[model samples]
Target: SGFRKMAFPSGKVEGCMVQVTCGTTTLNGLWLDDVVYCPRHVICTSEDMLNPNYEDLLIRKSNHNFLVQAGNVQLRVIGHSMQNCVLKLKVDTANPKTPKYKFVRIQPGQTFSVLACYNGSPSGVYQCAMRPNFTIKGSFLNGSCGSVGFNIDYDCVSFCYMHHMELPTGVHAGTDLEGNFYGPFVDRQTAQAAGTDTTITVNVLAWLYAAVINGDRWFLNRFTTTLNDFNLVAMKYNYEPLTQDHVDILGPLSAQTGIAVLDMCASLKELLQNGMNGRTILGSALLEDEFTPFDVVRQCSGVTFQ
Candidate 1:
């Protein structure tokens, strides 16, 4: 006898739905059980089909505790998985021929985490998957999971982090003015004699003295150009100076020039009054010849000749 075709509508099995089809035929005297089916097999296949796939897995990138610093890069992670299921991590470094993986077994309700350090490499997209390891063959009843994708650009600085630390001692202290102070050191005497020394006033000098008193200053004596040199001096006193380097390092200081001194005063006062020590300044560079100061107060307060 020839078998007859029969179609079945989608039915609930396990926690998911499944549809089946078969032919009507029976062997021996069994009358070819016209309609033959098993709910147990259908339910098992349905459950497998519902398993979370790699595409459905969640992935995120983040930096750990490491602070962003000069020449340092950002670190991130791409992770994915199903509830109470095994999660996996993978990395492709611009080379499709090779791939790396990190596998982690987790509970259904838990998440899997991956950590990747970006060192300004030219890597392409990174892909990850999260799904069951096995599935039934020859059946649409199984194999239904999705994964996720994440991309990173090393050339971009926006993704980077910044790190700051305490300013070391002996960095700004010294006598022989020029010798003790690093280059770009301002020659107050020379500047004063020039008659062009608009920066030699009592308020300006007081702030410089305060920097010495409070030990909140940065030395940019290494700069070349007289403008940069004196600007560094001005920065010590919280005074603003005009210089091209300043613009490059700190941006325009026209408006800031008049306000920086007072701002420095307020900042210095807080440091001195609170006895705050070991504060760090975070930035890419100082303002254009307009020196932007990041104060680092000393631990011990006292008078030093040099």
Candidate 2:
């Protein structure tokens, strides 16, 4: 064993921790008087573990894949392994009634679950997708699994999947939703589902899906002062902001058709709650669609995730 004294500035040691190591015989040989140091600072995101990548980050929002339209469903959440966090949940009703926004602290090994859609519906399907009635926003106070790690699982009525293959070549394909990208449906090379449904009807709602992406994106580009103020949520990823030309084209269409012209990546429930005046809205908006109009659905069949 060896004993040494070192001097370090407190600024350099702000978030550092000191460790003591010694064999049984050296236990009494350790010095303590002049070796005392200030307590380490608490850093939310740090490289602490031997393999730092294993640390999880706090999830900011829920995944759209688990959203539902109508039917009995259970929404579950699993907390982080290293720290405790709070999940802010907001449930909006079909009408403009007051929303139920509450917070729940989640800890490691604790599972949080809630029954939703007991009434069996979400004001019908606004867009092709099930209009969500509840929104989950998470904020963590400390670390992962326990502090920042989270898992969300849920079940819902089958989704009505439909594809729009009519997109032309070379045009920007698809729409953006809440930081998630969907499309290229026009490009056979990268086509995806035009929009999904869960309204359980033979005819699906199509325009809402298109409008949510197109309209929502337009609003952000047209209204927001700066994209840098916010993060990726403010604008479409990997694409330029929509110009006045988009508004000029879709504005009249929105007013005439009664579908929402702009959506801020929020849910239809949020749109209605905020008063859409019969117009529809979704977090993401669609940019292009010619062959398949936005107001109506193409067809329907058994639901699938594809």
Candidate 3:
């Protein structure tokens, strides 16, 4: 049984290098291609906060925490007891109730938005109103008085996958943005790593672009898109739909792991040894659990990439 697991974004995985050997060829410093590689987790976060004060910011209710996003703000007032507490927002003591934002009949814990009571430019010529500033006063039936605290955060990153790295003004990506002649192998490890990743094991989005045109390259030329019910014929694995229950005595996981991918994996290993000659392969016996079935996938198809 394939046990279900959910891994949280507890931390981050530093960009690391790996060396892999397929058949007789070996590649070093392999980097991950983000798109095609369906992993247990995908990075979906921005590296920096849009606002500075929000950095290392914490959240609490009684503290009058403010959640400021690119779009709007959320006012939090959960800390104090509900016993007849009155929360009010004001810019100046002289105008304590003038241009007011407030909450009445408070609960033990509660929240409100900036526009809960009012909106607009806060009394016209923009003189009295400024940034967000709030005040709260309360007395629980059983105890003493209460006060509210406040913080500001303009933005936050929830999840992250591809982190952006800045390159030189005219360096990187096999092409020079400036008129300068591109240097050769400035970072051979990076260059070699990228090539090996796409050619071999990476199922990245970039592979879709490179593999199609790379008829001369051994690995790229053999990239397959043939699908039997959205399951890659090349991998002999079905990924179209996911389920939590097994259908029979031996479910698809056992059936595929024990039967399907077992040989499909070996066939791929041998293909790497002897590079795929896709165009010349016979397409007639494609469904017979054979090699090169996906090789001629585009051969007889009406839709062509070019």
Candidate 4:
């Protein structure tokens, strides 16, 4: 009935950690993995700012607001009026000595990027603001005058992926980067509290790599070209429905992933009980209703677990 819920970057759940040192300064902190895990929200001035009739497109916009992703984090613009507002994207730092990057101002109907790269890496957080230009003003602006308000979006592309943590080495899944666990036990409670599925999607490539690391060649051989095929299926889900082609690829994946929906969830709880990270490398919540079902780990596959 609605998009599946997530809690990490939202503060209810813990997020992955990133420790980077551009120069003498070491930027080590917890960050939101919007690129790989759950993508963040693209906010709008009103519900109508998003297309009401649209079905499955993860990026949504109105005539005024548009959704853009860069440096592995999602970005959106909010404005005083959908008609005439000047948008400014600013990349700032909490530490004053980091040499603040420049801001880019964009006009309506123009294409823009969130240019917040530093030390050959993407910055962590960005601020976006909207101000009245010439067409509409006053009421929504609330006479704040110089600027209306601002919203913040997170970035972790270069920080988490390229800089600090190396893939196939860190085992902090299901918990925030701080080593705290948040798996089925936490998210299930979160889901019930929020009345939405708080489960996260598992990265297909990570899952495949997990199989390879586990020495499960038989399971890997079943999906001959799964890497290429599944990514396209995952990409297509943003705009299309599940078709036979999807089922042809993921139908086997789901059937062979070794755990049932509830069974997989139980495994998450078991790991958390053992004082490990709450999530499993296998997958997260079984998002039975999301468009991108191939990214789901709850398909109750029969793949043998060793």
Cα lDDT of model 3 by residue, 1-306, tens digit: 011111211111111112212122222110122111111011112231222122122212223331111113222222221111111221111211111112122111111111100110111110000001111111111101111111111221111111011123221211111111122222112221112101112111111212223322223332322123222432333111211211121132224233232233334344444545553222211111110112112221222234
**Candidate 2 lDDT trough over 10 residues, lowest sum:** 22-31
How well is each residue in 1-306 modelled by candidate 4, as lDDT tens digits? 112212112211112322222113222222232211111111212242233221222234332333223334434323211111111222221222221122223221111112122321333322211111101111211111111111112322221111111112221112221222222212111121112222222322224423433443222222232333433443433312223443444444445555332333233233323432333233433212222232223222222222
Ranked candidates (lDDT, high to low)? 4, 2, 1, 3
Local error of candidate 3 at residue 214 (angstroms) = 25
True-structure RMSD for candidate 3: 25.4
lDDT of each: 0.21, 0.22, 0.19, 0.25
Question: Which residue runs of candidate 4 sit more than 4 Å off their true CA positions?
Answer: 1-252, 277-306
- Writing each residue's lDDT as its tens digit, candidate 1 over 138-186 gives 1111111111111121221111100000112111101110112111222
TM-score of each: 0.15, 0.17, 0.19, 0.20
lDDT of 2 by residue, 3-32 (tens): 111111121111111221111100000011
TM-score leader: 4
Candidates 1 and 2, the one with greater lDDT: 2
TM-score of candidate 1 versus the correct structure, residues matched by position: 0.15
How many residue pairs of model 3 clash at the backbone? Answer: 11
- Over 4 Å off, model 1: 1-243, 248-306
